[PDB]
Coordinates of C-alpha atoms in Angstrom, one line a residue:
Chain A
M1 CA -8.0 -37.4 21.8
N2 CA -9.7 -37.7 18.4
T3 CA -9.2 -39.5 15.1
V4 CA -9.6 -38.7 11.4
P5 CA -9.5 -41.8 9.5
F6 CA -8.6 -42.3 6.0
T7 CA -10.5 -45.0 3.7
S8 CA -7.3 -45.3 1.6
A9 CA -4.3 -43.8 0.1
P10 CA -4.2 -44.5 -3.5
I11 CA -1.9 -42.0 -4.9
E12 CA 1.6 -40.9 -3.5
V13 CA 1.2 -37.8 -1.4
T14 CA 2.8 -35.8 1.4
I15 CA 0.1 -35.5 4.2
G16 CA 0.2 -32.6 6.6
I17 CA -1.6 -32.4 10.0
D18 CA -1.0 -29.0 11.7
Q19 CA 2.9 -28.4 11.4
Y20 CA 3.6 -32.1 11.0
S21 CA 3.8 -34.2 7.8
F22 CA 4.3 -37.6 6.5
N23 CA 5.2 -39.0 3.2
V24 CA 2.6 -41.8 2.3
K25 CA 3.5 -44.0 -0.8
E26 CA 0.8 -45.1 -3.6
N27 CA -1.4 -47.7 -2.0
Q28 CA 0.6 -47.8 1.2
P29 CA -1.8 -49.0 3.8
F30 CA -2.5 -45.6 5.6
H31 CA -5.8 -45.2 7.5
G32 CA -5.9 -42.0 9.4
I33 CA -4.4 -39.8 12.1
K34 CA -5.1 -40.6 15.8
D35 CA -4.7 -38.7 19.2
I36 CA -5.6 -35.4 17.7
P37 CA -5.7 -32.9 20.4
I38 CA -9.2 -31.8 21.2
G39 CA -9.5 -28.1 22.0
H40 CA -8.0 -26.3 18.9
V41 CA -8.8 -26.0 15.3
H42 CA -6.8 -28.4 12.9
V43 CA -5.7 -28.5 9.2
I44 CA -5.0 -31.7 7.2
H45 CA -3.2 -30.9 4.1
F46 CA -1.9 -32.6 0.9
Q47 CA 0.7 -32.3 -1.7
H48 CA 0.7 -35.0 -4.5
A49 CA 3.9 -36.5 -5.4
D50 CA 3.2 -35.9 -8.9
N51 CA 2.1 -32.3 -8.7
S52 CA 4.3 -30.1 -6.3
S53 CA 1.6 -27.3 -7.1
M54 CA -1.6 -26.8 -5.5
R55 CA -1.3 -27.6 -1.8
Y56 CA -4.8 -28.1 -0.4
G57 CA -6.4 -29.0 2.9
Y58 CA -9.3 -28.7 5.4
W59 CA -9.4 -26.8 8.3
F60 CA -11.6 -28.7 11.1
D61 CA -12.5 -29.1 14.7
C62 CA -13.5 -32.6 16.1
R63 CA -15.9 -31.2 18.6
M64 CA -18.1 -30.4 15.3
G65 CA -18.4 -33.8 14.0
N66 CA -16.6 -37.2 13.1
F67 CA -14.5 -36.2 9.8
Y68 CA -12.7 -38.5 7.5
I69 CA -10.6 -38.5 4.4
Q70 CA -11.3 -40.4 1.1
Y71 CA -9.5 -40.2 -2.2
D72 CA -11.9 -39.3 -5.0
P73 CA -10.6 -40.5 -8.6
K74 CA -13.0 -38.4 -10.6
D75 CA -11.8 -35.1 -8.9
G76 CA -8.3 -36.3 -8.3
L77 CA -8.0 -35.3 -4.7
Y78 CA -8.2 -36.3 -1.1
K79 CA -11.6 -35.0 0.2
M80 CA -12.6 -34.4 3.7
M81 CA -16.1 -35.9 4.7
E82 CA -18.5 -36.2 7.7
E83 CA -19.9 -39.5 8.9
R84 CA -23.4 -38.7 10.8
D85 CA -23.5 -42.4 11.9
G86 CA -21.5 -42.2 15.1
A87 CA -21.8 -46.0 15.8
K88 CA -20.6 -46.8 12.3
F89 CA -17.7 -44.3 12.8
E90 CA -16.4 -45.5 16.1
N91 CA -16.4 -48.9 14.5
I92 CA -14.1 -47.8 11.6
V93 CA -11.8 -46.0 13.8
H94 CA -11.4 -48.9 16.4
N95 CA -10.9 -51.4 13.9
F96 CA -8.2 -49.3 12.2
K97 CA -6.4 -48.5 15.5
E98 CA -6.6 -52.4 16.3
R99 CA -4.9 -53.0 13.0
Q100 CA -2.7 -50.1 14.0
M101 CA -2.6 -48.5 10.6
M102 CA -2.8 -45.1 11.8
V103 CA -0.1 -42.2 12.7
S104 CA -0.5 -40.5 16.1
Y105 CA -0.6 -36.8 16.1
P106 CA 3.2 -36.3 17.3
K107 CA 2.9 -33.6 20.1
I108 CA 5.7 -33.0 22.3
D109 CA 4.2 -32.2 25.8
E110 CA 6.6 -29.3 26.3
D111 CA 5.4 -27.7 23.0
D112 CA 3.0 -25.0 22.9
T113 CA 3.5 -24.1 19.2
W114 CA 0.2 -25.1 17.9
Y115 CA -1.7 -23.5 20.7
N116 CA 0.3 -20.4 20.1
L117 CA -0.3 -20.3 16.5
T118 CA -4.1 -21.0 16.6
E119 CA -5.0 -19.1 19.9
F120 CA -7.5 -16.9 18.5
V121 CA -8.6 -19.1 15.6
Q122 CA -12.3 -20.2 15.9
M123 CA -13.9 -22.6 13.5
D124 CA -17.0 -20.3 13.3
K125 CA -15.1 -17.4 12.1
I126 CA -13.2 -19.6 9.5
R127 CA -16.5 -20.7 8.0
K128 CA -17.4 -17.0 7.3
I129 CA -14.1 -16.6 5.5
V130 CA -14.6 -19.6 3.4
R131 CA -18.3 -19.8 2.9
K132 CA -19.5 -23.4 2.3
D133 CA -22.2 -24.0 4.6
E134 CA -23.2 -27.7 3.9
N135 CA -19.7 -28.7 5.3
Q136 CA -18.5 -28.2 8.9
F137 CA -14.9 -28.2 7.7
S138 CA -13.3 -25.6 5.3
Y139 CA -11.2 -26.1 2.1
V140 CA -8.3 -24.0 1.2
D141 CA -5.7 -24.5 -1.6
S142 CA -2.9 -22.5 -3.1
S143 CA -4.7 -20.8 -5.8
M144 CA -7.8 -19.5 -4.0
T145 CA -7.8 -15.6 -4.2
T146 CA -9.1 -13.3 -1.9
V147 CA -12.3 -11.0 -2.2
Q148 CA -9.9 -7.8 -2.4
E149 CA -8.0 -9.6 -5.0
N150 CA -11.1 -10.3 -7.1
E151 CA -12.2 -6.6 -6.9
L152 CA -8.9 -5.5 -8.5
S153 CA -13.5 -13.8 -10.2
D154 CA -15.5 -16.9 -9.1
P155 CA -16.7 -15.9 -5.5
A156 CA -17.9 -19.5 -4.5
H157 CA -14.2 -20.0 -4.0
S158 CA -13.1 -16.8 -2.5
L159 CA -11.3 -16.1 0.8
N160 CA -13.8 -13.7 2.4
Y161 CA -11.1 -11.8 4.7
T162 CA -11.8 -8.4 5.9
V163 CA -10.9 -5.8 3.3
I164 CA -8.1 -3.3 4.5
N165 CA -7.2 -0.6 2.4
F166 CA -5.3 2.6 3.6
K167 CA -6.1 4.9 0.9
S168 CA -9.9 4.5 1.2
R169 CA -12.7 6.4 2.6
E170 CA -13.3 3.8 5.2
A171 CA -9.8 4.4 6.3
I172 CA -9.8 8.2 6.1
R173 CA -12.3 10.6 7.7
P174 CA -13.2 13.8 5.8
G175 CA -11.2 16.6 7.2
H176 CA -8.7 14.4 8.9
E177 CA -6.9 13.2 5.8
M178 CA -3.3 13.8 6.9
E179 CA -3.9 12.8 10.5
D180 CA -5.7 9.6 9.8
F181 CA -3.2 8.4 6.8
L182 CA -0.1 9.0 9.2
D183 CA -1.8 7.6 12.4
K184 CA -4.3 4.9 11.8
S185 CA -5.6 4.5 15.2
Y186 CA -9.0 5.7 14.1
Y187 CA -9.1 3.1 11.3
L188 CA -7.9 0.3 13.8
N189 CA -9.8 1.0 16.8
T190 CA -13.0 2.5 15.8
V191 CA -13.5 1.2 12.3
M192 CA -12.0 -2.3 12.5
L193 CA -11.9 -3.3 16.3
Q194 CA -15.1 -1.9 17.6
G195 CA -16.9 -1.7 14.3
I196 CA -16.4 -4.8 12.2
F197 CA -14.2 -7.3 14.5
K198 CA -15.9 -6.3 17.4
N199 CA -12.9 -7.3 19.6
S200 CA -9.2 -7.8 19.4
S201 CA -9.5 -11.7 19.7
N202 CA -11.5 -11.9 16.4
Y203 CA -8.9 -9.6 14.8
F204 CA -6.0 -11.9 16.1
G205 CA -8.0 -14.8 14.9
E206 CA -8.2 -13.7 11.2
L207 CA -4.5 -12.5 11.2
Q208 CA -3.5 -16.0 12.4
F209 CA -5.5 -17.7 10.0
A210 CA -4.2 -15.5 7.3
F211 CA -0.9 -16.5 8.3
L212 CA -1.4 -20.0 8.5
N213 CA -2.9 -20.1 5.1
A214 CA 0.2 -18.6 3.5
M215 CA 2.4 -20.9 5.4
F216 CA 0.7 -24.2 4.6
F217 CA -0.6 -23.5 1.1
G218 CA 1.5 -20.6 -0.1
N219 CA -1.7 -18.7 -0.6
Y220 CA -0.4 -15.3 -1.8
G221 CA -3.5 -13.3 -1.0
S222 CA -3.4 -14.8 2.7
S223 CA 0.1 -13.5 2.9
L224 CA -1.2 -10.0 1.9
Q225 CA -3.8 -10.2 4.4
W226 CA -1.6 -11.1 7.1
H227 CA 1.0 -8.0 6.5
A228 CA -2.0 -5.7 6.2
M229 CA -3.2 -6.5 9.6
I230 CA 0.2 -6.3 11.1
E231 CA 0.9 -2.9 9.4
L232 CA -2.5 -1.6 10.5
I233 CA -1.6 -2.0 14.2
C234 CA 2.0 -0.9 14.0
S235 CA 0.9 2.2 12.0
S236 CA -1.5 3.2 14.8
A237 CA -0.1 5.5 17.6
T238 CA -2.8 4.2 20.1
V239 CA -3.1 0.6 20.7
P240 CA -4.3 -1.2 23.8
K241 CA -1.3 -2.4 25.7
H242 CA -2.9 -5.8 25.9
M243 CA -2.9 -6.0 22.1
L244 CA 0.7 -5.0 21.7
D245 CA 1.9 -7.7 23.9
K246 CA -0.3 -10.3 22.5
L247 CA 1.0 -9.2 19.0
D248 CA 4.6 -9.7 19.9
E249 CA 3.9 -13.1 21.1
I250 CA 1.7 -14.1 18.0
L251 CA 4.3 -12.9 15.7
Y252 CA 7.2 -14.5 17.2
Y253 CA 5.6 -17.8 17.0
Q254 CA 4.7 -17.3 13.5
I255 CA 8.3 -16.1 12.5
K256 CA 9.6 -19.0 14.6
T257 CA 7.6 -21.7 12.8
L258 CA 8.0 -20.4 9.2
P259 CA 10.3 -22.6 7.0
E260 CA 13.7 -21.0 7.0
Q261 CA 14.0 -21.5 3.2
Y262 CA 10.6 -19.5 2.6
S263 CA 11.5 -16.3 4.2
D264 CA 11.7 -14.7 0.6
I265 CA 8.1 -14.6 -0.6
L266 CA 6.1 -14.9 2.7
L267 CA 7.9 -11.9 4.3
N268 CA 7.3 -8.4 3.1
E269 CA 10.5 -6.3 3.5
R270 CA 8.7 -3.0 3.6
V271 CA 6.2 -3.9 6.2
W272 CA 8.5 -5.4 8.5
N273 CA 11.2 -3.0 8.4
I274 CA 8.4 -0.3 8.9
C275 CA 6.8 -2.1 11.7
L276 CA 10.0 -3.1 13.7
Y277 CA 11.9 0.2 13.0
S278 CA 10.0 3.1 11.7
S279 CA 6.4 2.5 13.1
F280 CA 4.9 3.9 16.2
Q281 CA 5.2 0.4 17.6
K282 CA 8.8 -0.1 16.7
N283 CA 9.8 -0.4 20.4
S284 CA 6.8 -2.7 21.2
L285 CA 7.7 -6.0 19.4
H286 CA 10.9 -7.0 21.3
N287 CA 10.4 -10.6 20.9
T288 CA 9.4 -10.6 17.1
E289 CA 12.4 -8.0 16.6
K290 CA 14.9 -10.3 18.4
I291 CA 13.8 -13.3 16.4
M292 CA 13.7 -11.7 13.0
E293 CA 17.1 -10.1 13.5
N294 CA 18.8 -13.6 14.5
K295 CA 17.2 -15.4 11.9
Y296 CA 16.5 -13.2 8.8
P297 CA 19.0 -10.2 9.2
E298 CA 19.4 -10.3 5.4
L299 CA 15.8 -9.0 5.0
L300 CA 16.8 -6.2 7.2
Chain B
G1 CA 1.3 5.6 -15.4
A2 CA 4.3 8.1 -15.2
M3 CA 4.6 10.9 -17.6
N4 CA 7.9 10.8 -19.6
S5 CA 9.5 11.7 -23.1
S6 CA 7.4 9.0 -24.9
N7 CA 3.8 10.0 -23.8
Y8 CA 4.7 13.7 -23.9
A9 CA 2.1 14.9 -26.5
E10 CA -0.6 13.5 -24.2
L11 CA -0.2 17.0 -22.4
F12 CA -1.8 18.6 -25.4
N13 CA -4.7 16.6 -26.3
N14 CA -8.4 17.6 -25.1
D15 CA -8.4 15.6 -21.9
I16 CA -8.3 18.3 -19.2
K17 CA -5.2 18.0 -16.9
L18 CA -3.1 20.1 -14.6
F19 CA 0.4 19.8 -13.5
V20 CA 0.7 20.4 -9.8
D21 CA 4.2 21.7 -8.5
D22 CA 4.9 22.2 -4.7
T23 CA 8.5 23.3 -4.6
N24 CA 7.6 26.7 -3.5
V25 CA 5.0 26.0 -1.2
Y26 CA 7.2 26.0 2.1
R27 CA 9.9 28.6 1.5
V28 CA 12.3 29.7 4.4
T29 CA 15.2 31.8 5.0
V30 CA 18.0 30.3 7.3
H31 CA 19.7 32.4 9.7
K32 CA 21.9 32.6 12.9
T33 CA 20.4 33.2 16.4
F34 CA 21.6 35.7 19.1
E35 CA 23.0 32.5 20.9
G36 CA 24.7 31.4 17.6
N37 CA 22.1 28.6 16.7
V38 CA 20.4 28.3 13.4
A39 CA 16.8 29.1 12.9
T40 CA 14.6 29.5 9.8
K41 CA 12.0 32.3 9.1
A42 CA 9.3 31.1 6.5
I43 CA 8.3 33.5 3.8
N44 CA 5.1 33.3 1.7
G45 CA 5.1 30.5 -0.8
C46 CA 2.7 29.4 -3.5
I47 CA 1.4 26.3 -5.3
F48 CA 2.0 26.0 -9.0
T49 CA -0.9 24.5 -10.7
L50 CA -1.0 24.7 -14.5
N51 CA -3.1 23.4 -17.4
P52 CA -0.4 22.8 -20.1
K53 CA -3.0 22.9 -23.1
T54 CA -4.6 26.3 -22.1
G55 CA -1.9 28.0 -20.1
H56 CA -4.4 28.7 -17.2
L57 CA -2.5 29.2 -14.1
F58 CA -4.1 28.5 -10.4
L59 CA -1.6 30.4 -8.3
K60 CA -2.6 29.5 -4.7
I61 CA -0.8 31.7 -2.4
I62 CA 0.5 30.0 0.8
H63 CA 0.7 32.6 3.6
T64 CA 3.2 32.1 6.4
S65 CA 0.4 32.2 9.1
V66 CA -0.5 28.6 7.8
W67 CA 2.7 27.2 9.3
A68 CA 2.0 28.9 12.9
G69 CA 2.3 26.3 15.7
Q70 CA 3.0 23.4 13.2
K71 CA 5.6 20.8 13.2
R72 CA 7.2 18.8 10.5
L73 CA 6.4 21.8 8.3
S74 CA 8.0 20.2 5.0
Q75 CA 5.9 17.3 5.6
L76 CA 2.7 19.2 6.4
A77 CA 3.6 21.4 3.1
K78 CA 2.7 18.2 0.9
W79 CA -0.7 17.7 2.7
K80 CA -1.6 21.4 2.7
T81 CA -0.6 21.4 -1.0
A82 CA -3.0 18.3 -1.7
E83 CA -5.7 20.0 0.4
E84 CA -5.7 23.1 -1.8
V85 CA -5.6 21.2 -5.1
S86 CA -8.5 19.0 -3.9
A87 CA -10.5 22.1 -2.7
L88 CA -9.7 23.8 -6.4
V89 CA -11.0 20.8 -8.1
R90 CA -14.0 21.0 -5.9
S91 CA -14.6 24.6 -6.8
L92 CA -14.7 23.9 -10.6
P93 CA -17.7 23.1 -12.5
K94 CA -17.7 19.4 -13.3
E95 CA -17.0 19.6 -17.0
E96 CA -13.8 21.7 -15.8
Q97 CA -12.5 19.2 -13.5
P98 CA -9.4 17.6 -14.5
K99 CA -9.3 13.9 -15.8
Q100 CA -5.7 13.7 -14.5
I101 CA -3.2 15.4 -12.2
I102 CA 0.5 15.3 -12.6
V103 CA 2.4 15.8 -9.6
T104 CA 6.0 17.0 -10.4
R105 CA 7.3 15.4 -7.2
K106 CA 6.7 11.7 -6.1
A107 CA 6.2 12.5 -2.4
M108 CA 3.0 14.4 -3.5
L109 CA 1.2 11.3 -4.7
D110 CA 0.0 9.9 -1.5
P111 CA -1.2 13.1 0.0
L112 CA -3.0 14.0 -3.3
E113 CA -4.4 10.6 -3.6
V114 CA -5.8 10.8 -0.2
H115 CA -7.3 14.1 -0.6
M116 CA -8.8 13.0 -3.9
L117 CA -10.8 10.1 -2.6
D118 CA -14.0 11.9 -3.5
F119 CA -12.7 11.9 -7.1
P120 CA -11.6 8.2 -7.8
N121 CA -12.0 9.0 -11.7
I122 CA -9.3 11.7 -11.7
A123 CA -6.0 9.8 -12.2
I124 CA -3.1 11.0 -10.0
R125 CA 0.3 10.6 -11.9
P126 CA 4.1 11.0 -11.3
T127 CA 6.3 12.2 -14.1
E128 CA 10.0 11.3 -14.9
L129 CA 10.3 14.7 -16.7
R130 CA 12.4 17.0 -14.8
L131 CA 10.4 20.0 -15.2
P132 CA 11.7 23.5 -14.1
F133 CA 8.7 24.8 -12.6
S134 CA 10.4 25.8 -9.5
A135 CA 11.8 28.8 -11.2
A136 CA 8.3 30.2 -11.3
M137 CA 9.4 32.7 -8.5
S138 CA 11.9 34.1 -11.0
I139 CA 9.1 35.5 -13.1
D140 CA 8.7 38.9 -11.7
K141 CA 4.9 39.4 -11.6
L142 CA 4.4 36.2 -9.8
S143 CA 7.1 36.6 -7.2
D144 CA 5.7 40.0 -6.5
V145 CA 1.9 39.0 -5.8
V146 CA 3.1 36.2 -3.6
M147 CA 5.5 38.3 -1.5
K148 CA 2.9 41.1 -1.2
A149 CA 0.1 38.9 0.1
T150 CA -1.4 39.5 3.6
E151 CA -3.8 36.3 3.5
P152 CA -4.4 33.2 1.7
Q153 CA -5.3 34.1 -1.8
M154 CA -6.0 32.5 -5.4
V155 CA -4.5 34.6 -8.1
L156 CA -5.4 33.2 -11.8
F157 CA -3.1 33.9 -14.9
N158 CA -2.4 32.7 -18.4
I159 CA 1.6 31.8 -18.3
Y160 CA 1.4 31.9 -22.0
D161 CA 0.1 35.4 -22.3
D162 CA -1.4 35.6 -25.8
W163 CA 1.1 33.2 -27.4
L164 CA -1.6 30.6 -28.2
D165 CA -3.1 33.3 -30.6
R166 CA -0.2 32.5 -32.8
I167 CA 1.4 29.1 -31.8
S168 CA 0.2 25.8 -30.7
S169 CA 0.1 24.4 -27.0
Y170 CA 3.0 22.1 -27.8
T171 CA 5.0 25.1 -28.7
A172 CA 4.0 27.3 -26.0
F173 CA 4.8 24.8 -23.4
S174 CA 8.2 24.2 -24.9
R175 CA 8.9 27.9 -24.8
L176 CA 7.7 28.2 -21.1
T177 CA 9.9 25.3 -20.1
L178 CA 13.0 26.7 -21.9
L179 CA 12.4 30.1 -20.3
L180 CA 12.1 28.6 -16.9
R181 CA 14.9 26.3 -17.5
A182 CA 17.1 29.2 -18.2
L183 CA 15.8 31.1 -15.5
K184 CA 16.6 28.2 -13.1
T185 CA 20.2 27.6 -14.2
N186 CA 21.3 31.3 -14.2
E187 CA 18.5 33.8 -13.2
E188 CA 20.6 36.9 -13.6
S189 CA 21.5 36.1 -17.3
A190 CA 18.3 34.8 -18.1
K191 CA 16.5 38.1 -16.9
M192 CA 19.2 40.2 -18.7
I193 CA 18.2 38.3 -21.9
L194 CA 14.5 39.0 -21.5
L195 CA 14.9 42.9 -20.7
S196 CA 17.9 44.1 -22.5
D197 CA 15.8 46.0 -25.1
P198 CA 13.7 48.5 -23.2
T199 CA 11.6 49.1 -26.3
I200 CA 9.9 45.6 -25.7
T201 CA 7.5 46.0 -22.9
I202 CA 5.4 43.5 -20.8
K203 CA 1.6 44.2 -21.0
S204 CA -0.1 45.1 -17.7
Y205 CA -2.1 42.0 -18.2
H206 CA 0.9 39.9 -19.2
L207 CA 3.9 38.0 -17.6
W208 CA 6.5 38.1 -20.6
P209 CA 7.7 40.7 -23.1
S210 CA 5.7 41.4 -26.1
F211 CA 8.2 39.9 -28.5
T212 CA 7.4 39.5 -32.3
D213 CA 7.9 36.1 -33.9
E214 CA 11.1 37.1 -35.1
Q215 CA 12.2 38.4 -31.7
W216 CA 11.2 35.1 -30.0
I217 CA 13.6 33.0 -32.3
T218 CA 16.4 35.2 -31.1
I219 CA 15.4 34.9 -27.5
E220 CA 14.8 31.1 -27.5
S221 CA 18.4 30.9 -29.2
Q222 CA 19.9 33.1 -26.7
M223 CA 18.3 31.1 -23.8
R224 CA 19.5 27.8 -25.4
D225 CA 23.1 29.1 -25.6
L226 CA 22.7 30.2 -22.0
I227 CA 21.7 26.6 -21.0
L228 CA 24.6 25.0 -22.8
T229 CA 27.2 27.3 -21.3
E230 CA 25.9 26.7 -17.9
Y231 CA 26.3 23.0 -18.4
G232 CA 30.2 23.0 -19.4
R233 CA 30.8 25.4 -16.4
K234 CA 29.0 22.8 -14.1
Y235 CA 30.9 19.7 -15.5
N236 CA 33.9 21.1 -17.0
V237 CA 33.3 19.8 -20.5

C-alpha cells in the first residue's frame, strides 16, 4: 500500500484518484491519499472550484518513486513532484498518517473496475505518448491536443498517440485499394500489430489510456484516438480470437464506468453503430452490445 | 468543397478539372429465368469523364468481362471507376493532370480518394448540382461505340464538337447540359427535335447536328419547351 502526500490544499478543488473523487475546501487540512494499490498505474486529477475548465492530472506508478503533490501559486496549479530522499519521505508520510490527515484509496474488495480499465496500461508506454523524460509521472489536461490534430502546434505539449488514418498510404497497399479499405486486416495485423505496436497488449494499452484521458479530462483528441483503434479492429475481417474476446471485455468496462450524463460527446454514434451492427465483428462484442443497448439505446 | 450554383463559373477558369460520372458503368437488363426467378444480364457500360472547359471526353468503355465471377457488382463498379480514373490521370503528362476531380455522385468520393492517394494535390470534390450526364447513352454515337466494343477501350471525343469556335465554355456547357436534360426527361421527343430536318447532318467526326447559330436558338427553345412540358405532366401543375 502506497501513499501520495500533499503539502497543502490552498485552493478549493475537486481531487480525483482513479475513478474516485473528493471535494476539498480552500485551506482545509488535506495531506494526501493513502493505501493506494501497488501494481497498477494511477492518475490523480484536479478541477478547481473556480474554473470548471481545464481538468488536469498526473499518471503515475508508486513502484517508480515517491511522489507528492504541492500547490504552486505562481503557475496556479497542483503539481506532482518526486522526493528522492526516501528517509525524508517516509517521515512526512508517517507524520501525516499519525495526524490522520489523509484519505484512504476507497477500494471495495469485490471491485476489479480499475484493474479492468488499466489492464494493459504500462507507465513506460505512457511516458512515450507524453514525452517529458525528466519526470517519472505524466501530465495531461483537457486542452492538450494530439500529434494527428497538430498535423491538420506546440509539440512539447502533444499526445504522441499512434496516428491512424484509413485513407492513407500506410493503410492501403497499392493494387489492393478496394480490398484494404473495406477489410483493414492488413492495416491492423501487419502494419499496426506486428509493425508498430509489436503485440496486442501494447495496442490495448494505448486504447485504454486513450479512453481514460477522454473520460477524466474530456480530452477530445483522446476520444478520437480511442474510437479509431476500436473501429480499426471492428473493420477487420481477420482478428485473433484472443483480441476479440479481450476487446469485448475492455469495452464493457469502459462503457460501464462512463458517467451516464456524458454519453453525448464521448461516444461516436457512427463508430459504435458500425462496430456493433455493421462491422465484421458485429457478432463478437456481446457484452459491449448488451450494455450499450440497455444503457444508451438512444445513441442507437 | 462541394460544387453548387454559387461557385459554378469556377468550371470555366483555367484550372484543369474533370467531371467524373459513373451512372453507366454497371448496366444490366433484368429478366425472368426458366424457373421464374429474376436474373440480370450485364451489358457494356462506360465511365463519362469530361473536362467542362475544353469539351474533351475520356469515354472509358467498361466491358462485361470485367464483372465475370465478381460479387457486389454495384459496389465493385465504384472502385473499378476510381481505378480507371486514377490510371487515366497517371497516363496524362503532368501539366495535363487535373487540379480537381468532381464526382457527380457522392458514393465515388471514397473510392477515388483512395485510388488517388498518389496525387494528394488533386482535390476530389462532390457536387450539389443535379447534372444529366447519365443521358450520355442517349447520344447515338457514344451508345454505339460502347455497345460494339469487344474489349476494354478508351475512346476520346469533344462533346462540344466545334462549338467553342463560336461560343464560350460557359455557353457550351449550358447547351450540353440542356440537350442532355432533355434527352433524359423524354428521349424520344428530344431526339425527334434534333433530327426532324434531314438537311442538317452530323459530321463524321462530330456528335451533334451542324446547326447554324440561328438554328441552335430554335433548338434550345424547343428543348426548353420540352423540359417544362414534361414537368407539368410529372407533377400535375
